[PDB]
Design a protein around this motif. Structure first.
Motif, PDB file in Angstrom:
ATOM      1  N   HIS A  41       0.739  -0.960   0.011  1.00  0.00           N
ATOM      2  CA  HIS A  41      -0.104  -0.010   0.111  1.00  0.00           C
ATOM      3  C   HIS A  41       0.719   1.311  -0.011  1.00  0.00           C
ATOM      4  O   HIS A  41       0.451   2.279   0.833  1.00  0.00           O
ATOM      5  CB  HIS A  41      -0.971  -0.179   1.040  1.00  0.00           C
ATOM      6  CG  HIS A  41      -2.083  -1.070   1.083  1.00  0.00           C
ATOM      7  ND1 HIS A  41      -2.310  -2.133   1.961  1.00  0.00           N
ATOM      8  CD2 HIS A  41      -3.090  -1.386   0.140  1.00  0.00           C
ATOM      9  CE1 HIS A  41      -3.166  -2.836   1.514  1.00  0.00           C
ATOM     10  NE2 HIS A  41      -3.686  -2.341   0.442  1.00  0.00           N
ATOM     11  N   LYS A 104      -8.285  -2.994  -4.006  1.00  0.00           N
ATOM     12  CA  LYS A 104      -8.307  -4.017  -4.543  1.00  0.00           C
ATOM     13  C   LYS A 104      -9.520  -4.947  -4.235  1.00  0.00           C
ATOM     14  O   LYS A 104     -10.097  -5.583  -5.269  1.00  0.00           O
ATOM     15  CB  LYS A 104      -7.106  -4.960  -3.668  1.00  0.00           C
ATOM     16  CG  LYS A 104      -5.805  -4.917  -4.188  1.00  0.00           C
ATOM     17  CD  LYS A 104      -5.208  -6.053  -3.562  1.00  0.00           C
ATOM     18  CE  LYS A 104      -4.922  -6.058  -2.152  1.00  0.00           C
ATOM     19  NZ  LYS A 104      -4.689  -7.342  -1.747  1.00  0.00           N
ATOM     20  N   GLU A 124     -10.304  -1.020   4.193  1.00  0.00           N
ATOM     21  CA  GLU A 124      -9.255  -1.329   3.681  1.00  0.00           C
ATOM     22  C   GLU A 124      -8.690  -0.063   2.962  1.00  0.00           C
ATOM     23  O   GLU A 124      -9.100   1.061   2.495  1.00  0.00           O
ATOM     24  CB  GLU A 124      -9.736  -2.143   2.440  1.00  0.00           C
ATOM     25  CG  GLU A 124      -8.802  -2.928   1.295  1.00  0.00           C
ATOM     26  CD  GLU A 124      -9.198  -3.170   0.142  1.00  0.00           C
ATOM     27  OE1 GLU A 124     -10.354  -2.983  -0.300  1.00  0.00           O
ATOM     28  OE2 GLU A 124      -8.403  -4.100  -0.736  1.00  0.00           O
TER      29      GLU A 124
HETATM   30 NA    NA Z   1      -5.231  -5.765   1.940  1.00  0.00          NA
END
Ligand code: NA
Length: 508
Positions: A41, A104, A124
Motif C-alpha cells: 500500500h 483491491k 481497506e
Molecule cells: Na489488504
C-alpha cells in the motif's frame, strides 16, 4: 498493472473553437492512473499540489498538505494563466481537478480534492489513485479575442509535502477562431471610404496624382494565419489588369490609375482582379482598436496587418470634369483547418481634371512671341502677319471668349507720342478690349479627329499709319498684342503676348 508515480509530460489541443458559440466542457485527463501497487500500500496517499496557491503561471490551487485526517470531498479549482501566442496577452481561466482512490477488493469512486488525505473503503487502505482534470463549460468565452492561447499546468505529485514523486506538466493550447470578426479595417473610415487622386497639371496635357488609404487586415485570430488572399477589383470589367475611373457626365471617357500595396513591410503591385497570395511569416503587425462586425464583442485592441494602398495616376489630355470609380477589396485569411470565408471593403475613388485652354498654330507648334511687320516704302503700308491657329482645350462644350488685354499700338521706340494703331482679328472677327464669343458649335470641333482641337482659325495682326493717306513717320516701332482667350463658366484663360515690331527708314 502496477505503476510507480513519476514525472509526466502531456499535451492537449483544444478546438479550433469559434468565439461565436459558448464553449463546451473539455476533458484534459479522465481517470488517468498515477500510481498503483497490488502487493503493497505504498500509494494509498497520492496527492497533487500546484506550485503556488496564488501565483497563476502554472496553475494556482492548494499547494500544501490538507489540514486534518478528514478527506476533502469535491473538486479542486485551479486558476491557470493562458497566454496568446502572437500578442502575449494573458488571461486566467478555471480548470477543475479531482482524484479518486483505487481499492483491491471494493469500489469507492468518490471524487476528492487534489490534496485530500486518504480514506478507507470498507476498512481497506487504497492501493492507488487516478487523476481527472477538465475545463468547465463557458470558460473559453472569457478569452477577449481569437488567437492561439497557451497554458502550461504543473502539478507536483506527492504523499505529504516532504515526499516528492515528480511533476505533471500538461501543455494546453486553445485554437480560438473568430470568423464573424474577420474584416478589412480602415482607420480613417467607419463606413463610406473615399479618396481623391488629387490630380494636378504638370504641363503638355499631362496630369499626375497620388494618394493613399490606410487599411488593416484582421483575421479574427491575432495574426496567426499563415497566409492572406487579397484581391483588388474595379467595377469596370473589361479583361485586363488596369483600373479606370469613368467620367461622371460621360461614361465613354476614362482615366487610368495604378495600385500599390505597401503592406507591413512587403511591397505588392495589385492588378485588376488578380488575387495576391501573401505569406505572413515575414509581415509586421500592429495593435489597433478594431470592434466587432456583429457578435461577439471585441472589448480590447487586437493585432492586425497594417497596410497603405497607394494610388498613382499619370494621364495625358483627359477631358475636363469629375471622374469616379470603385475599388472592391476582398480578403480571405488562410484557415487550413476548414473553409474560411471572404470579407470585403469598398473604396470610392474620385479625381478632378481642371479645365484648360491653349492657342496653337494649326501645325501644333506654339505661337511666336515676336513678329515684325514688313514695310513697303512704295505703298507706304505694312504687310499683315497672318497665321492659322487652332484652340486646344479639354472642355470642348464651352464658349470661347476672346479679347485683347489692352488696345495695342506700335509706338516709336524713341518717341512715346509717335504711334500707329495695331489691328488684330481672329477667326474672322476684329478684336478689341471688348470680348467676342465663339460658340463651341461654330468652332468646328472634331468628334472623329482629336478631342478639343478646333478647326483652323486665322490670326491676323496688322498696323497702318494713324491718319489715312499719310506716310508713317520714320523710325523704329514696337508694341505688344496681348491675346486673351477664356473658356465659359470655367473661369480659366490663356494669354498670348506677341511683341510686334516695324521699321520705317527715312526718305533720303
Ligand atoms: Na489488504
Amino acid at each position: 498493472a502496477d505503476k510507480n508515480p513519476g514525472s509526466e509530460n502531456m499535451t492537449n489541443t483544444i478546438g479550433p473553437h469559434d468565439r461565436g458559440g459558448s464553449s463546451p466542457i473539455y476533458n484534459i485527463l479522465n481517470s488517468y492512473l498515477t500510481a498503483y501497487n497490488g502487493s503493497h500500500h505504498l500509494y494509498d496517499r497520492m496527492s497533487f499540489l500546484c506550485l503556488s496557491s496564488q501565483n497563476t503561471l502554472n496553475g494556482a490551487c492548494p499547494s500544501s498538505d490538507a489540514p486534518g485526517t478528514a478527506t476533502i470531498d469535491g473538486e479542486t479549482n485551479i486558476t491557470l494563466q493562458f497566454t496568446e501566442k502572437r500578442s502575449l496577452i494573458k488571461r486566467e481561466l478555471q480548470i477543475k481537478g479531482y482524484k479518486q482512490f483505487l481499492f483491491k477488493n471494493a469500489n469507492c469512486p468518490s471524487k476528492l480534492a487534489l490534496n485530500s488525505s486518504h480514506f478507507q473503503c470498507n476498512r481497506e487502505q487504497a492501493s492507488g489513485a487516478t487523476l481527472s482534470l477538465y475545463i468547465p463549460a463557458g470558460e473559453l468565452n472569457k478569452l477577449p479575442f481569437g488567437g492561439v492561447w497557451n497554458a502550461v499546468l504543473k502539478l507536483n505529485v506527492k504523499r505529504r509535502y516532504d515526499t516528492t514523486y515528480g511533476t505533471y506538466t500538461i501543455n494546453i493550447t486553445v485554437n480560438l477562431t473568430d470568423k464573424g470578426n474577420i474584416q478589412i479595417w480602415l482607420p480613417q473610415f467607419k463606413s463610406n471610404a473615399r479618396v481623391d487622386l488629387n490630380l494636378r497639371p504638370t504641363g503638355g496635357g499631362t496630369y499626375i496624382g497620388r494618394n493613399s488609404v490606410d487599411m488593416c487586415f484582421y483575421d479574427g485570430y491575432s495574426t496567426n494565419s499563415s497566409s492572406l488572399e487579397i484581391r483588388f477589383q474595379d467595377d469596370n470589367s473589361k479583361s485586363d489588369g488596369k483600373f479606370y475611373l469613368k467620367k461622371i457626365n460621360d461614361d465613354s471617357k476614362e482615366l487610368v490609375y495604378t495600385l500599390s500595396l505597401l503592406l507591413a513591410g512587403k511591397n505588392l503591385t495589385p492588378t485588376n482582379g488578380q488575387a495576391l497570395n501573401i505569406n505572413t511569416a515575414s509581415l509586421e503587425t500592429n495593435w489597433n482598436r478594431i470592434t466587432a462586425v456583429t457578435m461577439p464583442e471585441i472589448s480590447v485592441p487586437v493585432l492586425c496587418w497594417p497596410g497603405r494602398l497607394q494610388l498613382d495616376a499619370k494621364v495625358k489630355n483627359p477631358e475636363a470634369g469629375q471622374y469616379m470609380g470603385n475599388i472592391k477589396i476582398t480578403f480571405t485569411p488562410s484557415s487550413q483547418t476548414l473553409d474560411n470565408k471572404q470579407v470585403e471593403k469598398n473604396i470610392t475613388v474620385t479625381a478632378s481634371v481642371d479645365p484648360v485652354i491653349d492657342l496653337l498654330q494649326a501645325d501644333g507648334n506654339a505661337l511666336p512671341s515676336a513678329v515684325k511687320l514688313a514695310y513697303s516704302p512704295a505703298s507706304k503700308t505694312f504687310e499683315s502677319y497672318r497665321v492659322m491657329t487652332q484652340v486646344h482645350t479639354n472642355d470642348a462644350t464651352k464658349k470661347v471668349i476672346v479679347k485683347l488685354a489692352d488696345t495695342p499700338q506700335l509706338t516709336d521706340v524713341l518717341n512715346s507720342t509717335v504711334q500707329m494703331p495695331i489691328s488684330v482679328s481672329w477667326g474672322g472677327q476684329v478684336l478689341s478690349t471688348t470680348a467676342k464669343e465663339f460658340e463651341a458649335a461654330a468652332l468646328g470641333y472634331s468628334a472623329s479627329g482629336v478631342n478639343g482641337v478646333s478647326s483652323s482659325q486665322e490670326l491676323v495682326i496688322s498696323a497702318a499709319p494713324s491718319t489715312a493717306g499719310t506716310a508713317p513717320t520714320a523710325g523704329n516701332y514696337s508694341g505688344v498684342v496681348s491675346l486673351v482667350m477664356t473658356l465659359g463658366s470655367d473661369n480659366k484663360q490663356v494669354e498670348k503676348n506677341i511683341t510686334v515690331t516695324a521699321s520705317v527708314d527715312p526718305v533720303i
